[PDB]
A paper describes a structure:
The nucleosome remodelling and deacetylase (NuRD) complex is one of at least five corepressor complexes that recruits and activates class I histone deacetylase (HDACs) enzymes and directs their activity to chromatin. Metastasis-associated protein 1 (MTA1) (and its closely related homologues MTA2 and 3) are up-regulated in various cancer tissues. They serve as scaffold proteins for the assembly of the NuRD complex. RBBP4 and RBBP7 are WD40 domain proteins with a characteristic seven bladed β-propeller structure.
To understand the nature of the interface between the R1 domain from MTA1 and RBBP4 we co-expressed and purified a complex between MTA1-R1 (residues 464–546) and full-length RBBP4. The interface between MTA1-R1 and RBBP4 is extensive with a buried surface area of 2,837 Å2. Two of these grooves lie on either side of the long amino-terminal helix that forms an extension to the WD40 domain. The final interaction region C is composed primarily of helix H4 which binds in a third groove on the surface of RBBP4 on the far side of the PP-loop. Comparison of this structure with that of the equivalent region of the R1 domain (region B in the description above) shows a highly similar mode of binding to RBBP4.
Numbering used by the authors:
A (entry chain B): 468 to 518, 529 to 546
B (entry chain A): 10 to 89, 103 to 163, 166 to 175, 180 to 211, 214 to 411
Write the structure that this text describes.
């Protein structure tokens, strides 16, 4: 088909964090076949240049039995 | 269909352009033949004065006419003002060892105690064992297995008790071999467990308990077995797990009680060994059958799954029952963390990288292998 490489640069890494509202990683993670606005975050990241705990498995099993099927 | 394949090819281009925003690592590589198996070997070499490290895989081939091979391939994973760091993979993914295999490799797994030893499932009842140090890395253009073990895709080495191997036989039974201290090339079964009524699909040892092992089959059941019990015709427990054929299972590495099972009813079911009557959770979202499911080695609340659909979903069960917006409800449930749309065909198998967190290798029926890591900002906040 077409082999390729991707090591994401550290400018793109924090560009996602700075432009969280435009990117929407929570939305984009489950929508791989929606084209992301690649122009908008690149404009806002350059324009706005100058500037987690997981909760254990004991808690989620306790939640699952507390809120059952 | 000529229309559908065109719609797949466009969606691959959409995905490919999104990869800097959805991933930190993507490494596509077209194999000569499509692999039905994939597993990371536990070792990692850190070469002197470089910005990468050599991890290794255990791949196979699925071919009718040409000679099949047990493959081992190296992979270069990087160590720790321009956008989109695209390059070109060349000399990063390469084949180290090729060994001749009799028939197609439906599954291949390394022995936890001695990673040099690899068992391989066949379409027939038997399981062939190979030691890749014993064989030459350059095969001539004749299979030569170290042990043949007579008796679905199920295969599992026991992490405790070296040399104990399980597999799903062709006659609705689960074989059990003991290859430690063989006096003789051929080996026969120690035990044959006859519980299931239909074709057994997958079988897995329990991680902390030498005697415990689970199994799944086309008869819609999850059977938790005990090798110490004399009655081989009936298991310790038996659940009606799903509404269709159950194709896979996997125990949680951070909890002795928890496990997951995938099935042809488009759902991964979460279970607890302390109560097999209650089903803890049913992960709904997948658009076709589930054939594989794996827990993350690093994170207890993370598991991934794949199957007949070209997408591989990653589940974060720490987000179960979180307050979403109504826009996020359309996307899916909150426990669904990430969807991987890199493949354009049925994902046969995948495997989490044991050394580097969040790196997964997946293979598919369109000849391609993808080593990838999802974006840092998705899993961390």
């Amino acid at each position: 088909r077409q082999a390729f490489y991707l090591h994401t640069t550290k400018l793109t890494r924090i560009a996602r964090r700075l432009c969280r509202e435009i990117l929407r990683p929570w939305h984009a993670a489950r929508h791989p076949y929606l084209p992301i606005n690649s122009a908008a975050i690149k404009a806002e990241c350059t324009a706005r240049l100058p500037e987690a705990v997981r909760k254990p498995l004991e808690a989620v099993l306790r939640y699952l039995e507390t809120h059952p099927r | 269909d000529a229309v559908e394949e065109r719609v797949i090819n466009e969606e691959y281009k959409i995905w490919k352009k999104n990869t800097p925003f959805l991933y930190d690592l993507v490494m596509t590589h077209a194999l000569e033949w499509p692999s039905l198996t994939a597993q990371w070997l536990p070792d990692v070499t850190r070469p002197e004065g470089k910005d990468f490290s050599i991890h290794r895989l255990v791949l196979g081939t699925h071919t009718s006419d040409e000679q099949n091979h047990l493959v081992i391939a190296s992979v270069q994973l990087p160590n720790d003002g321009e956008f989109g760091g695209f390059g070109s993979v060349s000399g990063k993914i390469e084949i180290e060892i090729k060994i001749n295999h009799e028939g197609e490799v439906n599954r291949a797994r390394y022995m936890p105690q001695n990673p040099c030893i690899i068992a391989t499932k066949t379409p027939s009842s038997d399981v062939l064992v190979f030691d890749y140090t014993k064989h030459p890395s350059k095969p001539d253009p004749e299979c030569n297995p170290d042990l043949r073990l007579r008796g679905g895709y199920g295969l599992s080495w026991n992490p405790n008790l070296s040399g104990h191997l399980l597999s799903a036989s062709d006659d609705h039974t689960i074989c059990l071999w003991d290859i430690s201290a063989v006096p003789g090339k051929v080996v026969d079964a120690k035990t044959i467990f006859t519980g299931h009524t239909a074709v057994v699909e997958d079988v897995s040892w329990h991680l902390l308990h030498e005697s415990l092992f689970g199994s799944v089959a086309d008869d819609q059941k999850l059977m938790i077995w005990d090798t110490r019990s004399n009655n081989t015709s009936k298991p310790s427990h038996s659940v009606d797990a799903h509404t269709a054929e159950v194709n896979c299972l996997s125990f949680n590495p951070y909890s002795e009680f928890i496990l997951a099972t995938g099935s042809a009813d488009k759902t991964v079911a979460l279970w607890d060994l302390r109560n097999l009557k209650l089903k803890l959770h049913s992960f709904e979202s997948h658009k076709d059958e589930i054939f594989q499911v794996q827990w993350s080695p690093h994170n207890e609340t993370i598991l991934a799954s794949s199957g007949t659909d070209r997408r591989l979903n990653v589940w974060d069960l720490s987000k179960i029952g979180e307050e979403q917006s109504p826009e996020d409800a359309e996307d899916g449930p909150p426990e669904l963390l990430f969807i991987h749309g890199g493949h354009t065909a049925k994902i046969s198998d995948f495997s989490w990288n044991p050394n580097e967190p969040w790196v997964i290798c997946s293979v598919s029926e369109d000849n391609i292998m993808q080593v990838w890591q999802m974006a840092e900002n998705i899993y961390n906040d």
